[PDB]
Each structure stands twice: as C-alpha cells, then as structure tokens.
C-alpha cells in the first residue's frame, strides 16, 4: 500500500498486506552475523627462506614477506616500513596485466562483504604449508601494538623468534601434518575495530596516513623456517555495529 | 592406562567449516570493554530489509536510481525487472549484496517507488508481477492478468509493492549460470495507467525513485562466496 519513504523507514510487508495471501516464513538462522563469519577464509600468505635455527630478519620476495599483520583489511609494506602495515587501498601485483593477484594481503571475502562500520571478535588463525615437504618452522605471535623485538639470537643456532615469552608455535617432523592453528583473543586497545574506513589520523600532529586507525589489528605473525605458508582467519564471537554500504559491483 | 584409538582416514585435514574450536594461545585476556557502543545488529537479514536503490538505465545508458514518466500512457512498461536476486538492475542494492553471499532465498520482496514529481502532478501507475510460464507480459491487458496494484499519486509519496513468493520449490537460487525454474521467477513491470497530469509551469518529466529489499517473511540461507571480480 501507500507509504512515505521520506520518514526514513517504511514497513516490511508480505503478500497479505495488498493481496489475498499468507505469510510464508520458515525458521532459518544461517544469516546470523556470528554464524556467517564463523568459518575460515583465506586471508594472507607468508614466505621464508631462512632456516629455523637462525636470526629472523624481515624480507620481501615478489610481494611476500616473512611476517604478516593480522587484520582482514589490506596490509602490505607501506612506504618502506620495516614490517607490513595496514594499507588504504589494493594494488595489482603486476605493473602491466591489471588483473589479480594483488600485492596487498587481505581477507577478500571480508573486504567484499563488510556491511558494517565497526566489528569485534576473537581471531582463529590457520597457517598451512603450500607443499608436502616435511615442515620445520617456528612462528611468533605478537599482540596488537606490542614490541616486534627483531633482535639477534642470544644463543647460537636457536630460532630467534622462539626467544620470547610471546605466544609462539614450533612444528616439525615426519609425524606432523604441515599446518598450525590456534585462536587469539581481541588485543587492540580500541573497543571496536573500524571495518572499512577510519575518518581520521593516528597521532597528535596529524601527520599519519589519513584513513587508518591507530592499533587496529590483532597483532602480528613472524615466521622462520623454509617454505611458503597460506593463512586463514575465522572470526569467533563476531559482533558488528552500524550498517554501511558494501563494495560496489560493476553493472552487468 | 593409555586409551586405544582408531585414527580415522582423514587425519591432519583442515576443515574450514568444522563446527569446533582450536587451541587458545593467549587466554585469560579481557576483550577491551565496548558497553558504550550503539548500532549493533546480529542478523544479516536486517540489512536485506533496508530498501536500497535499483539501477535504471539513462537515455545515454548511464545508471540512475529512478525512471521517467510524463503526460502519456505508453503501450509498453516504463520499467521491467526480472525477479532474481541476480537481476542486474538490483546488482548494487544491499539486498543483492547480501544475497550474493547465500545460496538460496524464500519469502517476499518489497519494491518501493517514491514519486518525486511536483505536488501539482497527478497520475496512476499499475505495478504488476507476472509469474513465469507464459513469458513476459506484452501488453497492459496481459500485465493485469497477474498480480498487480494500482498506485495513485497524492499526499502520500511512495508505494510499497510486494512481489509474493510464488514458487514450485520452497527455496529459490540467488544466482545461476543459465536461468532455470528455480532461479528466475517472473517479472515486475510498472505501467502508466493514466498519464501523469499537471498544470502549466510544471516540468513534463517526473522522476520516480526505485528501491528493493526483502519483505517481512524474507530469508536467506547457506553462506557461500560469490564469483569474484576486479573492482572498477
């Protein structure tokens, strides 16, 4: 029937309002935000050419670093930063093709579908070796905004990444299944994280990159040992706030 | 004593959707308080129900959120939307954006039309929903043969039209390679019943905003990933 969209809200009707019909609803709860985001989606990739028993040193090789920033939003080395930082845009890895892969790391499924302005959750991370050669790797998890501690080994022939009280994982051997998974709690000093844009600066002289919030991540993962590893994120107890537009899709 | 175990044939497999958790490596940590927050929502369906804009074609093939009507009654529909959450006309509505991440839908669809012409402009439209089987309606005579509502302009500016869920199956696909009887469900066409009528000093063309959203009993199910594309 008639209404007035200028009110900013109109009723949700079913066929019975204007016609001789009945409501036809069936129970369904797979649209719940928690359920939807509670599944693992590819969100990053990591590569290392250093052995386990050596000093970890930040490196990049064809757009792959040996450490990542834990955030569904695009991240990459920004203006020669030592470690990857959150990006404000996505770029093709290739300077010519104008087709993906992108040089930036992110959870494509999150970027392409995040109809909210802020989110809150714990993060379940899965790290998988891209081939079947027996794994021998050490990973260090650094909480949001904590010291990276990219120091020298304090003892000969030991993985510098394991030289910490920070949570770290060590998998190696013929009995392992070439992967690692674990869940970390939300560690940002922010109450909720911005899911798309942050309309401001991060420091007091407003000289940072406008659009990026301060400490808006889940920490970092540093890796040593040989191999290329893919990473997945799974959002536990996910909560979202303030509905907002989704990424635009080209007209068919 | 140790427990005997039978290692299943899928040892070491990483299931991206297993309904189970993994090992907590930094527990006993407080999640930074956010009790002051507002605007939280828990169901993606909430989004589907917010009316957002349909993309209509310009005379220059440019996309606009409305269609034109004037002092005449064309023998053809002013606009035609195929009922599919795949329709290109609704490709950028929140409804379609959410539906792209689910396999099936069920329930009502709400097509909202907002008359933006002058207050001195009057007229009547016939909004029709034609179920499939006999093709698209070619005339007003045919369009009236199906589900329809007559929209009369006046004090109230908009008309909330519902495309009833009429289907051979309980659920319908949100997308498809080729149209099937389970993924394409007919057409919504709006006709000019009486011409837009008005006094002198009033522009001949009136613009009617067009929006879509899920109705009261609308639901989606089966989380999936849509065909990827390069933004541009």
């Amino acid at each position: 029937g008639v209404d007035n969209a200028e009110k900013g809200k109109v009723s949700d009707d079913n066929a019975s309002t204007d016609f001789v019909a009945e409501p036809v609803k069936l129970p369904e709860n797979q649209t719940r935000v928690s359920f939807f985001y509670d599944r693992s989606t590819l969100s990053s990739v990591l590569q290392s050419t250093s052995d386990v028993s050596s000093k970890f040193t930040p490196s990049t090789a064809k757009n792959l670093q040996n450490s990542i920033l834990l955030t569904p939003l695009p991240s990459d080395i920004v203006n020669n930063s030592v470690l990857p930082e959150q990006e404000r845009w996505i770029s093709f890895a290739s300077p010519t093709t104008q087709k993906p892969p992108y040089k930036t790391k992110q959870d494509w499924n999150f970027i392409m579908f995040s109809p909210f302005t802020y989110y809150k959750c714990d993060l379940e991370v899965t790290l998988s070796k891209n081939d079947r050669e027996t794994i021998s790797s050490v990973v260090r998890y650094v909480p949001c905004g904590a010291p990276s501690d990219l120091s020298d080994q304090t003892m000969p022939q030991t993985p510098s990444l394991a030289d910490t009280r920070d949570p770290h994982m060590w998998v190696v051997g013929q009995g392992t299944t070439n992967q690692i998974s674990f869940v970390i709690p939300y560690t940002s000093p922010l109450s909720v994280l911005p899911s798309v844009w942050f309309n401001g600066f991060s420091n007091f002289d407003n000289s940072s990159r406008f659009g990026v919030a301060p400490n808006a991540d889940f920490g970092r993962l540093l890796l040593q040992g040989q191999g290329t590893f893919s990473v997945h994120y799974r959002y536990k107890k996910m909560r979202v706030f303030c509905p907002r537009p989704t990424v635009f899709i080209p007209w068919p | 004593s140790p427990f005997p175990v039978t290692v299943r044939e899928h040892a070491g497999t990483f299931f991206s959707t297993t309904p189970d958790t993994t090992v907590p490596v930094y527990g006993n940590t407080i999640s930074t308080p956010f009790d002051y927050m507002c605007g939280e929502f828990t169901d993606l369906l909430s989004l589907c129900k917010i009316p957002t804009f349909l993309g209509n074609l310009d005379s220059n093939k440019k996309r606009i959120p409305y269609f034109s009507a004037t002092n005449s009654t064309p023998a053809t529909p002013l606009v035609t939307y195929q009922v599919t959450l795949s329709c290109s006309c609704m490709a950028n509505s929140m409804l379609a954006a959410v539906a792209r991440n689910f396999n099936q839908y069920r329930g009502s669809l709400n097509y909202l039309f907002v008359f933006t012409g002058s207050a001195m402009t009057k007229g009547k439209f016939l909004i029709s929903y034609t179920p499939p089987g006999a093709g698209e309606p070619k005339t007003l005579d045919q369009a009236m043969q199906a589900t329809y509502a007559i929209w009369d302009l006046g004090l109230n500016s908009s008309y909330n039209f519902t495309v009833p869920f009429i289907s051979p199956t309980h659920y319908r696909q949100t997308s498809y390679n080729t149209p099937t009887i389970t993924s394409v469900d007919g057409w919504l066409t709006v006709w000019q019943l009486t011409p837009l009528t008005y006094p002198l000093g009033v522009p001949n063309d009136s613009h009617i905003l067009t929006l879509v959203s899920g109705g009261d009993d609308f639901t989606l199910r089966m989380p999936v990933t849509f065909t990827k594309y390069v933004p541009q």
Binding site: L26 | P19, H170
Partner: peptide, 24 residues
C-alpha cells in the same frame, strides 16, 4: 540405518544432520 555407536554424536544434531522441517 547403520549407525551403531553408543556414545552420543560429538557434533550436535543440527550440525551433524540437515534439519527436517515441515512447511505446514
């Protein structure tokens, strides 16, 4: 048929099996 484990299924019934529902 063909299920003969005495301890209950580890995954809840909603998840282990599709949910049967009547539309009427």
């Amino acid at each position: 048929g063909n299920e003969g484990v005495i301890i209950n299924n580890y995954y809840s019934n909603q998840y282990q099996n599709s949910i049967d529902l009547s539309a009427n």
